[PDB]
Amino acid sequence: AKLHDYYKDEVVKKLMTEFNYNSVMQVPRVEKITLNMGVGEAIADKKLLDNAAADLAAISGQKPLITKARKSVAGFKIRQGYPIGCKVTLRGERMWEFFERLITIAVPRIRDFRGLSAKSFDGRGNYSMGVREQIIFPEIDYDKVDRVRGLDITITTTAKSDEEGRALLAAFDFPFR
Amino acid sequence: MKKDIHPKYEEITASCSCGNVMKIRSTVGHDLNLDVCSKCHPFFTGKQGRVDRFNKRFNI
Amino acid sequence: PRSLKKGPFIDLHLLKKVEKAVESGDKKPLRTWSRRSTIFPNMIGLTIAVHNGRQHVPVFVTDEMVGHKLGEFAPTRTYRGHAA
Amino acid sequence: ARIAGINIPDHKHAVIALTSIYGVGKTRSKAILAAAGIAEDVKISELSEGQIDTLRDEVAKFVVEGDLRREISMSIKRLMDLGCYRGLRHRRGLPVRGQRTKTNARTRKGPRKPI
RNA sequence: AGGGCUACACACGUGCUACAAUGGCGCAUACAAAGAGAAGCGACCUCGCGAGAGCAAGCGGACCUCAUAAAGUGCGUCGUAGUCCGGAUUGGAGUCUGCAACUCGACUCCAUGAAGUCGGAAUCGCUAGUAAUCGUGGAUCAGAAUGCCACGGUGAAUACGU
Ligand SMILES: [Mg+2]
Ligand SMILES: [Mg+2]
Ligand SMILES: [Mg+2]
Ligand SMILES: [Mg+2]
Ligand SMILES: [Mg+2]
Ligand SMILES: [Mg+2]
Ligand SMILES: [Mg+2]
Ligand SMILES: [Mg+2]
Ligand SMILES: [Mg+2]
Ligand SMILES: [Mg+2]
Ligand SMILES: [Mg+2]
Extents of the domains making up chain C: 2-82
Q: Are C37 and C67 in contact (CB under 8 A)?
A: no
In DSSP terms, A129 is beta-bridged to: A153
What distance in Å separates the CA atoms of residue B15 and residue D104, rounded to the nearest whole number? 54
For the domain made up of A3-172, the CATH class stated in words is: alpha beta
Edge to edge, the sheet with strand A152-157 lists: A65-68, A83-90, A30-38, A152-157, A127-130
- Residue B36, CB half-sphere, CA atoms under 13 Å: how many? 23
What distance in Å separates the CA atoms of residue D89 and residue D111, rounded to the nearest whole number? 18
Parallel, antiparallel or unpaired: strands B32-33 and B10-15: parallel
Question: How far, CA to CA in Å, does A5 sit from each of A160, A174, C37?
Answer: 23, 17, 68
What distance in Å separates the CA atoms of residue A94 and residue A151, rounded to the nearest whole number? 18
Nearest to B15 by CA among B30, B33, B29: B33
Q: What share of chain C is helix, strand, coil (3-state, %, to 5)?
A: 30, 20, 50
Question: Helices A12-19 and A162-171: crossing angle, nearest 10°?
Answer: 140
Indicate the burial class of D8 (C-beta count within 10 angstroms; 0-12, 13-18, 19 or more): buried
Nearest to A151 by CA among A96, A119, A106: A106
How many Å lie between the centroid of ligand 11 and the Cα of residue C3? 41
Indicate the burial class of A176 (C-beta count within 10 angstroms; 0-12, 13-18, 19 or more): middle
Which residues in B lie closer than 8 A to residue A55 (C-beta atoms)? none
Residue C84: how many other CB atoms lie within 10 Å: 5
Q: Are C37 and C7 in contact (CB under 8 A)?
A: no
Indicate the burial class of A42 (C-beta count within 10 angstroms; 0-12, 13-18, 19 or more): buried
Sign of CA pseudo-dihedral D71, D74, D79, D82: negative
Parallel, antiparallel or unpaired: strands C30-32 and C47-51: parallel
Collapsing DSSP to helix, strand or coil, B24 comes out as strand
What distance in Å separates the CA atoms of residue A86 and residue C16, rounded to the nearest whole number? 73
Alpha-carbon distance C83 to nearest alpha carbon in chain D (angstroms): 8
Helical residues (DSSP H) of chain D, grouped into ranges: 14-18, 26-35, 49-60, 65-82, 85-92, 106-109
**Do chain D and chain C touch with ≥3 beta carbon pairs under 8 Å?**
yes
Residue A172: how many other CB atoms lie within 10 Å: 15
Binding residues of B for Zn(2+): 16
Q: Are C59 and C50 in contact (CB under 8 A)?
A: yes
Collapsing DSSP to helix, strand or coil, D43 comes out as strand
Task: Find the Å distance, CA of residue A57 to C1' of nucleotide E3.
Answer: 69
What distance in Å separates the CA atoms of residue C21 and residue C13, rounded to the nearest whole number? 12
In DSSP terms, A87 is beta-bridged to: A36, A65
Task: Find the Å distance, CA of residue D105 to C1' of nucleotide E21.
Answer: 32
CA-CA-CA-CA dihedral for B29, B33, B38, B40, to nearest 10: 170
Q: Are D99 and D65 in contact (CB under 8 A)?
A: no
In DSSP terms, A90 is beta-bridged to: A33
Q: Are A85 and A49 in contact (CB under 8 A)?
A: yes
Nearest to A35 by CA among A74, A95, A89: A89
Q: Are A111 and D66 in contact (CB under 8 A)?
A: yes
Collapsing DSSP to helix, strand or coil, B59 comes out as coil
Q: Are D8 and D20 in contact (CB under 8 A)?
A: yes
Q: Are A153 and A60 in contact (CB under 8 A)?
A: no
Q: Are A35 and A151 in contact (CB under 8 A)?
A: yes
Which positions on chain E have an atom < 7 Å from some protein CB?
1-13, 77-79, 84, 88-98, 100-106, 109-114
C51 strand E contact, CB < 7 Å: yes
Question: How far, CA to CA in Å, does A149 sit from each of A140, A153, B15, C28, D115?
Answer: 11, 13, 26, 61, 41
Whole-number CA gyration radius for chain C: 14
Question: How far, CA to CA in Å, does A8 sit from each of A18, A29, A161, D89?
Answer: 16, 10, 21, 60
Residue B19: how many other CB atoms lie within 10 Å: 9
Query: Resolution, rounded to a tenth of an Å?
Result: 1.9
What distance in Å separates the CA atoms of residue D27 and residue D9, rounded to the nearest whole number? 18
The DSSP H or E segment spanning A153 is strand A152-157
The verdict on a CB contact (< 8 Å) between B53 and C67 is yes
After which residues does chain C show a gap where C to N exceeds 2.5 Å? Answer: none
What distance in Å separates the CA atoms of residue A166 and residue A120, rounded to the nearest whole number? 10
Which residues in D lie closer than 8 A to residue A111 (C-beta atoms)? 5-6, 65-66
The verdict on a CB contact (< 8 Å) between D82 and C64 is yes
Helices (H) and strands (E) in chain C, counts: 1, 3
Q: Are A39 and A84 in contact (CB under 8 A)?
A: yes
The number of angstroms, rounded, from the C-alpha of D60 to the middle of its chain's C-alpha atoms is 15
What distance in Å separates the CA atoms of residue B38 and residue A47, rounded to the nearest whole number? 35
How many Å lie between the centroid of ligand 1 and the Cα of residue D100? 6
C80 strand E contact, CB < 7 Å: no
Nearest to B18 by CA among A132, A44, D56: D56
Q: What is the DSSP letter of C38?
A: B
Question: How far, CA to CA in Å, does A46 sit from each of A36, A52, A66, A88?
Answer: 17, 10, 11, 19
